[PDB]
Each structure stands twice: as structure tokens, then as C-alpha cells.
Symmetry: C5
């Protein structure tokens, strides 16, 4: 018989009247495109720009009655992408592209196959840099929902309807891990149908839930801030009433708590609200600032001067150095109970 590209040239080129500019089912029902993606790569989830780079295989399936061949014996006629500008294709785009490209190495990475009843599979490889707003109210313990939405640009709802398929509409690669987050297996598949003054346009989207990994900030942020709070508690044991060394232990633990507070937001967006790492690095700034403020209470009370009055202010200098020695591991530990149970209920 005929070779299939030449068999398909008479199905398209100038003898069958196939016009690649005019959609199937024209002057009738709209085209029902059913979509599913395959995430090869995921990640580089920046928060300064609030975006993430995904790498998908975008599969699209629609029906074209004009491509319904009826006397070739096989079931799937493929097509190399040189003659892929000769069929109708849906004008899908992404509402939050922020730059995206195809992949054109050794061949344009595209796929086409045409079934006997005109079912057209069409798979392209796309790298997207998708925008998602970061809600950083509880910053190391937040579940980010970053989405991607697939709209139509030139055709309204009575021309082209996007759907997800029901056979697992978002697949994910086999060992797809992330350095900072983990990807949850529940992916919401819902509609996002838009409206403009141009009209209404179809839209489908897929939410991706991105639970963080708390195990990094529990090494850089929370534990070296925990040691400086213990370091200020050395000053209650130093020289048993007062010293010039307790000043320098009260100065320095405020410095590398302030510098570490400024280093807790080194590569973050400049959000207006106050977040979970901002109410840990500022309350523990208060425990190391009150330790030198504790010494200013000792060095002013104990340096005051009958024969009875000598032992009355040193006894007010030991009680301030044996209550504050135990009350600071009481106020700090009850904050430690209040901080993490609040961010487990949330």
C-alpha cells in the first residue's frame, strides 16, 4: 500500500481540503481536549522571585473527524514534527508562565499519533518557570500550595474545552525528590474558568502541595540560637555577685543574637508580616538582652552602702542571683512548649 506519511499527505495536503486553521467539529460542539502531564524534573523553588521550575510532558488528546482514515490496516499513524505545523493544534498556554521554552535537541521533542477514528495524541516537552505566591506566616513549618493553570487564549468555551483525564491526570517521575521540600501524593484537579471583557475562556489547573523539610532550619537557625541563650546563663555563675566579665558576656550574646537575627532573613522575600523565624529570633533576643539587664539590677543594688545594712543588700544580691538562675530556664522552657505546640496545631 502507501507509505504512511504519503498516505497522510493525501489526507491533509490540498486534495482533502484539510485546513489547519479551522478547528474540528466546526459549527457544532466545541473541541473537548483532555490533558495530562508528566513531571520529569521539579524544583529550584526560589522565594525571592516566588517561582519554581518544572519540566513536564504535556499530553493533549482531541478528536479530528477529518483525520479519520478508513482503509489503512494499522491503528496508529505517527508523524515526525516537520509536518506538525500542518494539523490543527489547541492554543494552550499557562496563565503564570514567567518565561518558558521548548526543547529542541537533536529533534524538536514532540510526539504525534493519529488513531483510526481521528483520536490525536500530542505530547511536547516544556520547561516552565511557574509563579506561585508564598504564604510565609509560619516559615519553616508551612505547607505551600503552588499551582499551574492551563488556559486557552484565542478560543472561548463554545470553541475549545479543556479537561483532565480520569486515568491519573498528573503523573510524577519515579525517584523525583527535592532538596528542600517534599511533594505530597494528593494533587487537586479542579477548574479555574476565567472571564474577561473578551469573554470567558476555559482553564484547568493542578495544585501541588509542598511540605517543607524542617530538618535544615533545625540545624542552622534554631540550635545556634539555642546555644546563645544557654551562653547568657553562664553569667549567673560568673564570680557569684558581679564582675567586669559579666558585662562582656552580656554584650556579646546580644551581638551574635542580633547578627544571627539579621542572618535569619538573608535570602528571603521582604514581606511585611511577622513570621515564625521572626518570633523565635526576637524572643530569644529578649532572653539574652534581659541577662545584661539582670546584671544592671545586680550591679546597682549590690553596690549600695549601719552595721546591719551591710548584710541586707548582699542578701538582695544573692536572691536576685538564685531566683534568676532558675527562673530563666523556667520562662524559656515554657516558651519552648508554647512555640512548637502552636505550630503543630496549625
Amino acid at each position: 500500500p502507501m507509505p504512511p506519511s504519503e498516505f497522510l499527505d493525501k489526507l491533509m495536503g490540498k486534495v482533502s481540503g484539510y485546513d489547519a486553521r479551522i478547528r474540528p467539529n466546526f459549527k457544532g460542539p466545541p473541541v473537548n481536549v483532555t490533558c495530562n502531564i508528566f513531571i520529569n524534573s521539579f524544583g529550584s523553588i526560589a522565594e525571592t522571585t516566588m517561582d519554581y521550575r518544572v519540566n513536564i510532558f504535556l499530553r493533549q488528546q482531541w478528536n479530528d473527524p477529518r483525520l479519520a482514515y478508513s482503509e489503512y490496516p494499522d491503528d496508529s499513524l505517527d508523524l515526525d514534527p516537520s509536518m506538525l505545523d500542518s494539523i490543527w493544534k489547541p492554543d494552550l498556554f499557562f496563565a503564570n508562565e514567567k518565561g518558558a521554552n521548548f526543547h529542541e535537541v537533536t529533534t524538536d521533542n514532540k510526539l504525534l499519533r493519529i488513531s483510526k477514528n481521528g483520536n490525536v495524541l500530542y505530547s511536547i516537552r516544556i520547561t516552565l518557570v511557574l509563579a506561585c505566591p508564598m504564604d510565609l506566616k509560619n516559615f519553616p513549618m508551612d505547607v505551600q500550595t503552588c499551582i499551574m493553570q492551563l488556559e486557552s487564549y484565542g478560543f472561548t468555551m463554545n470553541d475549545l474545552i479543556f479537561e483532565w483525564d480520569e486515568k491519573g491526570a498528573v503523573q510524577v517521575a519515579d525517584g523525583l525528590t527535592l532538596p528542600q521540600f517534599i511533594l505530597k501524593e494528593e494533587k487537586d484537579l479542579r477548574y479555574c474558568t476565567k472571564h474577561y471583557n473578551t469573554g470567558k475562556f476555559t482553564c484547568i489547573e493542578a495544585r501541588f502541595h509542598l511540605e517543607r523539610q524542617m530538618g535544615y532550619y533545625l540545624i542552622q537557625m534554631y540550635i545556634p540560637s539555642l546555644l546563645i541563650v544557654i551562653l547568657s546563663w553562664v553569667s549567673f555563675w560568673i564570680n557569684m555577685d558581679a564582675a567586669p566579665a559579666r558585662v562582656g558576656l552580656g554584650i556579646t550574646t546580644v551581638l551574635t543574637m542580633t547578627t544571627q537575627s539579621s542572618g535569619s532573613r538573608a535570602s528571603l522575600p521582604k514581606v511585611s508580616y511577622v513570621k515564625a523565624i521572626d518570633i523565635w529570633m526576637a524572643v530569644c533576643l529578649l532572653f539574652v538582652f534581659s541577662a545584661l539587664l539582670e546584671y544592671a539590677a545586680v550591679n546597682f543594688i549590690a553596690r549600695q552602702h549601719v552595721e546591719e545594712m551591710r548584710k541586707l543588700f548582699i542578701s538582695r544580691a544573692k536572691r536576685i542571683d538564685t531566683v534568676s538562675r532558675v527562673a530563666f530556664p523556667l520562662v524559656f522552657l515554657i516558651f519552648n512548649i508554647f512555640y512548637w505546640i502552636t505550630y503543630k496545631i496549625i
Copy 2:
């Protein structure tokens, strides 16, 4: 009847004499293009480069009498962007482009429709990186007006006239938020008509007012600078006349006020003038520098030595340590009144 692209091929291609190089209403009135944009994304407003990245849907509407079909029954003939190089289009550009691109993922993201009387809607998706000059005289409390202006390049005022439409000429996406600024709902829509030695060229523009979010600099810049000013006031309570510890408390609070002053302009343009964060981080540098300068007044007066003269310089060492203990929370708090009321009237 005819399919619409084939119906439009005889309206354009070589049988109707439609030349895509020659504007409508030729040798007559100029073409009245009416424009409106739709901001999908906004932000990444850098100040080192003084620019911002917007993502718009640029809609244009003009009238073409040559496209006035009169016997097709519908009201809107669309066109896929393959045959969009076959009509006349206005040569709109942006006077402050600084790099811009189209969006060509899965289809060139363009729109066309032609009404019965020749009204042509034309919508393209553009990512712009628009230049705006930053007036940073009062830096965390400024209202930036960053603009975008839409000129004509090859055609003068007697050939092509840009207008905004009256039905909401700048729309904004639904939940369009910003990390650092907030976008005000009042957008000025005015003319910017240019003049060269080539002639005069039409221009329309849209001002965008960008009020900041003070809630970030009120966490990193103003509060850790507030604590160091309190930290120098510890030195008035330390050892009740003088100490070697009051030197190290007078040295160190100048260091991490100077280092924090140099860190208050880490990612800013190198402007010549003096700004609001520069008159807070330098006046509070003076409160922590005068505290060690207060100790140089104590340690020189009190270390001077009849039997009357012993109690005359210690009484000049307590008065300097009980006036300065209260006058510094008087001079600093009256600066705190003077600083923020000045930047609320402005």
C-alpha cells in the same frame, strides 16, 4: 457557505487587493487605535537596576474598512496567528522597554477577531521589564510612581493616534499581590506626546502608584537599631562611677551600629542624596557614640585629686551620671517624635 479562513483568504489574498503594508483610512483621517491592558503578573521591582517586570495582555482595537465583510452570517471571525502577518497592525512599542519578549508556548499567544464593520480586536501577551526612576528621599516611606508608555515608532500623529478606552483601560488580575509593595487602585491615564526632529509621535501612558510596606524595615532596620541605643544606656548603671567594662560597652555599641549602618544599604542604588534610613542610622550612631564620649567626661573629671576637694569631684561624677541617665531617654524620645511625624506629613 464558505469556511471562515477561506472566506477571509478571498478578503485578503491577491483578489481583494488587501495590502498589509498600507494602513486603513489611507489619504484620510488617521487610524484611531484604542488600547487597554490586563496585568497578569507584577513585581520583581529591583532598585539596583531601577526597573520592574510586568506581564500584560495588550489589547488593541482599530477599524479596517477593507475587512468589512457583508454576507457572512456571524459577528466575529477569528484567526489563528499563522495568518496574522497578513493584516495591518500598529507599530506600538514601549519607550522604556529595557528588554521584552513575546510568549510562544504551544502556540504564539496572540488573538484576532474581525467584526462585521471591520472592528479588529488584537490581543498579545507581553513580558516587559520597564524602567522607572526611583525617588528614594524618604526610603521606607515613599510612594513610587513607576510608569509605562506606549508610543508609535514609524507613524506620526496624522497617521496613527493611540487612545485609552473608557471602559476601564487598565485592569488588574484578581489576587495580584506583591511581596514588598502594594498597588493602589487609582491609576492615572494621560498623554505623553513626544517630539523629535523626525516629527511628533503619539503616546499614551499609565502611572502606577506603589506604596511600600513599612512592616519589613520595622523589623530588620529600626528595631535592632533601637536595641543598641538601649544597650548603650546600660553603661550608666554599670559600677556607678566608672569601670573598664563601660569602655567595652562604649566601644562595641559603636561597632555594630556602624556595621549595621553599612548593612542598611546592602542592596540599594548608590544615590548621592541622604535618605530616611540614612538619618536614622546616623543619628542613632550619635547616641551610641556620645555614650562612650560621656564616659570620657566621667573618667577625666572623677579621677582628679584638700579634705574638701575629695567630695567635690565625686558630686560632679554623680550629677553627670544622674542627668545623663535621664536626658538620653529625653533627647532620643524627642527625636522619635520628630522623625515619624515628619514622615507622616510627607
Copy 3:
């Protein structure tokens, strides 16, 4: 006779029926493409992005019976890449591209030659930025296996089969060195055959083992952390019972151990687990934190006060200053034995 391009124009163009869209051995056995690469450049192995940039010469060899010329006297007809869009080529791609490009300087850097029996060599120059997951559990002493895999996109296993050849399927350039790693000469050449809902697709890959160079982190990370642990041991010799100087030697060696701990992960991914440089910079943080905690045991015991009791607490102040003077070079050196022998067995 004929010039070879004109001799090949009648072998391809419209007189021989050679269709560049239809694979050889059609309706028969699949095409057996045999591949081998030549690594010109290698490196820029980033860990923030977890990728690496390679520069290869991708050679492909398949058989085309339609190109079997039989009366030209030579053995290898080449072809400049202008008429290289006129033959069939396999649609090889890389499953972890993350951006890649050709090289088109002074000529498209491509090669073609056609043997007498239709054997087609095809060599192109590609720059790849290949993704590989970093397993950083033992960070300066890990052997990274970063791969690259060569799939087919549009053709299944019954259409196109990739193979490596047996004559050294991965060559490497002559003096190809790396700044941070070294490349091992054993390269695994195995199959990675994929499966989708589209079907199954061929895949071959090549593992690259990248042993690090420990000699850099043995200069910046481990030795300046070794000196601060020695620096805290000065405090056992300072003023022979206690001093205000031993406080400042116990404060400061915790600071530049904490700051150096935060600088041990300056340009690394934010992984959740705990790595080899994280259990060196935190255990040696404990040796410099226990030195000031040793002084808090001295300054509280020795400052307590019959005539017998005066020499009983100073003898408990020398024993704590002659056991701890030797036990800390015992506990630290047995950790030094335990740390490096663990990472030589692994």
C-alpha cells in the same frame, strides 16, 4: 562521473522516492542506532542547582538501505549540514536536559558520512546541563554518581532501539581535569528502558563516578576549626585558677566556632539530613562550649569559703584544672580517631 552532492541529490530528491519522514527498515525490524560520546569539557558541577555542564560529541550510527549507492567508486560520501534536513535522523533526547543547545559558530557543528552499504555516521556537538541528585550524607568524602540518559521520544521499542557500541562507548578528552572532583575511569554502560501510558521507549545511559578532592575542605573547614579547639585549651593555663580573661577566651571561641559553623554551609543545598561537615562543626562546637562551661565549674567551686576548709576547695580547683587539661586532648583525639576511620570504611 558525478560530483557527490549531485550524486546524492538523485539518491534523495524526488526521483528516488527517499522520504525523510519515514524510517529505514520500515514495516520490518526496528532501527538499531549505536551511540558513543566524546566528552570535550566537563564540570561547573553546582550543588545548589544539583546539575553539571558537559560538552559532548554525540555520534550516532544507523543503517539506511535507501542510501546504499552501488556505482560510486569511493567509500564515504560526506555532506555539509545544509542538506542534513533531507535524511532521516533519530529523535534522541536527554531525559534530564535542563536546558541544552547546539553549537553554530562559523558552520553548524555537525557531521555526516554515508558508507556504500548505507551506514550513516552522524556527529553533533552538544552542550548539556544535566541534572543529577546529590547524596551529601558524608559531604567532603562522597563519591557522586551523576548520570546522563539518552532516550527516544516519538518512537517505541519496535521502531528504534538505542545501543552503545563496544569499542569504548564513552571516550574522554586527553587532559580533562576538574577543579573540585576527579573523574574515575570506570564508566557503567547500562539500560534505563522507560514505560509510560504512551508505551515503552528505549533508553541507554552512562554513569559517571565523581570522587571529590578532600584537599580543599582540609584547608578551609577542618584546620581553622582545629585551631579554635586548641585555642580554648589556652584557658586552662591562664592565671592558674581563674581570671576575667578566661571568660573572654570562653566567649570568643564559641562565636567564631558558631560563625564558622554557619560558614560551613554557605553555598550548599538546604538538605534536611545531617552531614559529615555538620557533625564535625557541631562536636567541635561542643569542645569550645564546654571550656567556658569548665570555667563555670571552677569559678563556683573555688569561690566558696574553718582553717581546714581554705585548702580543701583550692585542691578541688587544681584537680579540675589538671584533669581537664589532659582529658580534653583525650576526648578530642579519640573523636579524631572515630571520625576519620568511620569515613574510610564508608
Copy 4:
């Protein structure tokens, strides 16, 4: 009559013999192209790369006798840039391009008009990243002359001659300001005619003088270096002969003078010579290093020990503490006179 593009198609296309490959005035005088630019944007003047990004409207005017229409009634036939590859255009380039691009948003931003005698105006919008060598001998007080030069590539002096016009050959936009520099209104317009082994080629250029804004480095560099020099002068008033506090005031003001010296060249090229900020941050490093060296003269002389000899070394400890208290605001202020008057004569 005829529409003008169709009137110009018979002036160019295959009936008039107009060849777009062969210059006007051929086998005669060379083509006299007269140029003028319009700077829309200017800036991002980096010094690490030693370049600057300009955005110009490059206007070119030459004479083509083959385009001299003689029976159309108007005076200026324009042309949309689709048929702009059909006329002769000069092969102007920039000798210091370092990357440059056109602007192709919504239309290729080009202009053409043809007068009745064949005068051809041609305006394109270009973004350039032009290289200029930075002479940083006196770094905050230098006048940089960064140039741009417009050569011919394929045609020698007997084929194509570039000129500036006399009606303001370099215009500048209306409110074109800069963050770091200011642009002087005097722009030199001179020749730069090149010579190779290929021959000699025409060249015109325009110098741009870029005076800096001293008001930034007078806030970050010179004033916080001025305060540390005052901070070392506290040590002459501290404890009136000697102290352990004067050591820590002599140590620390060398540290944050050295760290501030290393931060005075954070984002600069690594030039070999010594610049104006390098002889301020090193001489003021000597005033804070001699202050601790002053204490080493006090603490060695005054700690030496008949009944006459007790008051003879303390009188050599007050004279060294009342000469050096006044001589350092004498040597530093005469350096302050010598530093700025030297950089006002230059």
C-alpha cells in the same frame, strides 16, 4: 494614483533593476552617510566588567538616486519594515559591542522614509552594552570618558563614509538622570578612522563625560572611617595614664578599620595601582594603629622604677599624654587639608 507601497514595488522589484546588494553612486563617489543618535536610557555602568548599557535611536541618512521618484505628489514615502530587506543599508557596527540586540516588540522597531530626491532616513532602536576602560586613579573624584564608536565593516573609505550631522548629532532624552553619575552636556564628536591589513575603514565616535556623585562615598566610606579615627582618640582620656581598656580600644579600632578597608573595595575591579580610597583607608589605618602604638610607649615608660625617680617617669607619662592628645588632631587635620585640595586641583 498608485498606493505608495505598490508605487514603491515598481521602483524596487524586478522592473526597475534595483539591486539591494549594490550601493548607490556606484563606480563613483562613496556614499556619505550622516548619523545622529538619541539616548533614551543610559546607565547600569558596571566597573567589574567595565561597561555600560545605553539604549539609542540610531538614525542614518544617505542618498539613493535609484529611489528618486518623480511623479508622486507627496514628499515622504514611508515603508513598514517587512520590505526593509529590499533596499541598500549601510553595514554600521560598533567597535565595542560586547553584546547588543534589536527591539522587536509588536513590530520590528524600525523606521524608513524616502524623499523625492532619494534622501533615505532610517531609524532603528538598539540596546548596546558598550565597553569603556575605567581610569580609577582617583576613584570617588574621577571624570570617566566612556565612548562609543560607529565603524563600517565590509566597505572601505572609498565606498562608504560616516559623518555626524551638524544639527545636534547626539541628543539626550528629557529627564535622563543617573543614580551614580551625572552626564555632562559637552559631548565630543570626532573621528576614529581605523586601519587594518584589510585596508582602512571609516569610523565616527562620541565621547561621554561621566562626572561622579561624591555624595554617596561621603556617607559610607569617608564618615564611618572618620568616626573610628575619633574613636581611637578616646584612649588618651581613658584612666589618665594607662588601663587594660586602652588596649581593647587600641585593638578594636584597628579591626573595624581593617574590615572597613577590605569593604572599601567590595565591588570594584582588581586594579594594580593605588587609588584615592586606598590612600584614605590606609592612612587612617595608620592613625588608629599608632594609637595602640602610643599606648605601648606609655605602658613601657611609665612602668619603670630613688625618691627623685618616682616623679620623673610619671612626668614623662603625662607629657606623652598631653602632646599626643593634641598632635593627633594636628597631624590628621593637616592630612585632611592635603587630601581634598589635591583632588580639587586634579
Copy 5:
């Protein structure tokens, strides 16, 4: 006579049989291409990536007997680059491209001219980012030889032979200076002929010797490290036996020697070996670490306690403070002799 492009159209297009796919001197001697470059710009020599960006005019000269016109009166027929895809051109590439581009501003920056005997000059402007391995064993005093090599891709030695010409095969622009290096005038011009399993391919290259400028690291690295070594020598004059101030002068000069050591490799590749700035910043780390280790010898010997024994340990506390006061400017200055004479012989 004929216009030259039309005179050259009959020399190339379909009447002379000139095939642009088939090299000159076919079935005979190979094509002898003679090359020479002209370096316009040079620099941005990064060491993290180990590459450098050059901007060349690549001239190529070969002989084509098919272009030997014999009845046109002139000597050099040029050609605008529109019809430059119509001649044979050599497939030169660079073996270490790492990304490169042409320059296509206002015209494709290309040149062609054809002499009467068929000599073809061909000059293109290229920006290269060429890879070179950095040998940083003696880092501020090394002579880097960074190369560039010009290979053939599709043609072997019996088809196409590259040569340098003898009339100055590498020219350099007039005032081509560098910020960090200087370019030596001796440039080696030698062969680099490659061999693969494809065959052997021609190659020519040009070594560029890049001597550094020592005058930058002699300001940031060596002199502020020289002052800290002098700063530790203050401690021998402080309080004449021992002090708590000599501890803080022995602590701090180890800190900002360690921090300055970590800042001596801020923007360098992470090489395994030990370099010249690594044996200066570590030996001078030993002079400031032995100064506090000198105090631990004083404070333990001098604090030991008959009537004879009182003056026997203070005399062992002055001898350790008058030998070490002079021996450290003896051991450091003999290292200063040993360090720089070693790196002048090399």
C-alpha cells in the same frame, strides 16, 4: 559592463554549476585555509569557571578556482552577507567554545572579497568564551597560558588544512589593556592536530601568556596580614610581665587572621592543592597563634612560688619577654626572605 553582484550571480547561480556544498580543488589536493585573528576585546577572565571572553575578527583565506573571473577589470569583488550562503566556507570551530555567538547589529558583521585568481578573504566577528585550565600553585605570582584552538569538524586532513599566515598571525588592538593581568607580546603559534575514531582533523592554536598584576594582592591580602603580625608584637610590651589585656590581644589577632584567611579565598576555585596565598595566610596565622601561646608560657612560669626563689622565676619571666621580643622579628623576617625569593626564581 555588468554590475558585480549580477556579474557574480552568473558565476554562481545555476549557469556556472557552482555548488556551494562541494569544496574547491575537489578530487585533488586539500584546501589550504590560512587564518589570522584580530583581538578587539579581551578579558573578564574568571577563575571560578576557568574561562575568558575574547572578541575576535576571524579572517580566513582560501583559493576557489571556480570563482576565478577573467574579464572584469577590477581586482576585488566584495559581497554583502545576504548572498554569503551561496559560496563554500570552511567549517572552522573552536575546541573549547563554551558558548559563542556572532554579531548581527545593523548588518550581519561579515566580510567577503574575491580576487581575480579566486583568492577569497572572509572576515567574521565572533565573541568567544574560551575555556582554559588555571594552574594556581603560586597564585598571585603565576603566568597563565590560556589558549584557543581552531579545528575542522566535518573534514579530515586530506580535505581541509588550516594554517596560520606568516604576516603577524595574531594581531591585538591598539590600547588593549586588562584590569587584572597584562598580555605578553610573545604569542606561540603551533599545531594541535587531533585524532579520533572518526579520523584525524586539522587544528591550529595560539597560546596567550597572561602575567598577573601583583599590585592588587599586595594591597588587600599581604599588607593587612602584615599589620596583624605586628599587632601581636604589641603584647610583648604590654604591662611588662603579664596582663588580662595580653589575652584579648592574643585572642583577637587570631580571629581576624582566621577570618582574613577565609577571605583570602572568597572568589576562587576550590582546588585541592596548597597555593602561595595559602602558605602566607597560614604561616602568619602561626605567628599570631604563637603569641598567645607565648603568653601561656609566661603566665604559667611567672605565677609559681624560699627568699631566693622569688627572683628566680621573674628572671625567667623577663628572659622569655626579651628573647621573644626580638626573635619574632627574626623568624618572621627570615620567612619574608624565604617567601619572595622562592617566587622570583619560579
